[PDB]
């Protein structure tokens, strides 16, 4: 437990071994205190010295201690990461990726992940310095299982950070260069590798349809659906996020998710005890019901409408909001038969019960659904017996009370329904 000035005195000595002991003392400060003195280290001017120690191939111990110390500085604020980058650390770490000492190469991987994890600017600067080639070469082995578990996990996590962030998204050529390795990692049988691999995919699919196509063309959808059914929550969460991103694209992209068997998993996802899973599963459903009518029919066939009625009936409000969207898209693009079936499953009552929430956006969504439901009844000549349903469950008391609502389109559609069916 040295003081910062003692560390300074050692690193400023003209003795490599005294520099080594001081650098190690710094590393222990930065890795053992709950609130490490990163800023005091930076202010003392030690970052340039640490960076210079990265290049002392004749003393692998001081390479490791400096790499560890800089890794933990880089794991702090954007300003602390910037101090590491400003000391010229990026090229020095990339040159350590070729080290014959596995624990040193791993530490350089770790440090680069923290730098890239700061944002799109440093992510792209790591790429411009040529980090991808040597990173991917560390995984150019016939069987990933022969690599150390902690080593492989750190490589996967750092790669996911190179896929991370938008405004802008990673360079297209960088994504194409990484994807083959990501796909291979997506099949490795370690829970942590799988989780971070799914996260990387979820980042790459969070964008316009051309980005989604890059991923879907690699044929990873069936594997994502498989991980969607995993028992480890840390895997299901990113797998579901990736699947949800894919279904925001075209109807053809959404169809690959359906063809892979995704809908069969949603009974459990839509009743999953983790609130976030249920919410994201219902968001995914809302983008499937906005597709073609034959895709709406697969939702019906898989028995998922009762589950939408269930979430609409009882769930976290954010989840109910997503379900309301799911029903509006359903009724806008669905056939008359499909809309009739939706009523026969009990959609109306829970739909009405949600017309008394403190959220203007959901009321609008609900009222558009009712209109598109009434529209389907007009085409069948029984707007009456639907009006009674909405009456018997207390739906007319709400819609009446919404005509006197302080908002643009609430009383608009409210008046319209009242005076056209009631």
């Amino acid at each position: 437990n040295w003081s910062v000035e003692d560390i300074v005195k050692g690193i400023n000595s003209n003795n490599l071994e005294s520099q080594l002991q001081a650098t190690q003392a710094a590393r222990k400060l930065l890795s053992r205190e709950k609130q490490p003195p990163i800023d005091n280290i930076i202010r003392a001017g030690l970052i340039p010295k640490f960076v210079s120690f990265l290049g002392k191939t004749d003393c692998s111990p001081i390479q490791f201690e400096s790499a560890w110390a800089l890794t933990n500085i880089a794991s702090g604020t954007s300003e602390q990461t910037k101090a590491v980058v400003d000391g010229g650390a990026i090229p020095a770490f990339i040159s350590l990726l070729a080290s014959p000492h596995a624990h040193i190469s791993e530490q350089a991987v770790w440090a680069l992940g923290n730098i890239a994890g700061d944002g799109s600017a440093f992510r792209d600067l790591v790429i411009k310095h040529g980090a991808i080639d040597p990173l991917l070469a560390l995984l150019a082995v016939p069987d990933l299982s022969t690599l150390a578990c902690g080593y492989l996990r750190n490589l996967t996590w750092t790669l996911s950070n190179l896929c991370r962030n938008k405004n802008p998204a990673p360079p297209l050529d960088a994504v194409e260069q990484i994807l083959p390795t990501l796909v291979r990692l997506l099949h490795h049988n370690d829970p942590e590798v799988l989780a971070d691999s799914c996260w990387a995919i979820s980042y790459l699919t969070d964008g316009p349809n051309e980005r989604i196509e890059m991923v879907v063309k690699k044929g990873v959808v069936p594997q994502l659906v498989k991980l969607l059914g995993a028992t480890e929550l840390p895997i299901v969460t990113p797998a579901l996020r990736a699947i949800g991103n894919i279904v925001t694209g075209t109807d053809e992209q959404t169809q690959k998710v359906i063809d892979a068997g995704a809908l069969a998993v949603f009974p459990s996802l839509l009743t999953n005890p983790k609130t976030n899973i249920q919410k994201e599963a219902t968001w995914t459903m809302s983008n499937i019901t906005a597709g073609r009518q034959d895709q709406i029919q697969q939702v019906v066939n898989h028995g998922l409408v009762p589950f939408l009625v269930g979430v609409l009936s009882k769930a976290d409000f954010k989840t109910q909001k997503e379900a309301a969207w799911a029903i509006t898209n359903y009724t806008s693009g669905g056939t008359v038969e499909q809309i009739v079936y939706l009523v026969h499953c009990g959609i109306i009552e829970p739909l009405m019960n949600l017309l008394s929430a403190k959220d203007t956006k959901i009321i609008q969504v609900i009222l558009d659904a009712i209109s598109n439901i009434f529209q389907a009844a007009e085409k069948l000549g029984e707007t009456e017996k639907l009006s009674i349903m909405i009456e018997e469950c207390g739906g007319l008391d709400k819609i009446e009370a919404l005509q006197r609502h302080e908002n643009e389109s609430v009383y608009k559609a409210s008046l319209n329904l009242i005076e056209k069916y009631f």
């Binding site: 890795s31 490490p36 560890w68 890794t71 933990n72 880089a74 770790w110 992940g113 991370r164």
Partner: peptide, 6 residues
Amino acid sequence: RKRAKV
């Protein structure tokens, strides 16, 4: 996004 080695 960032990890310290502790």
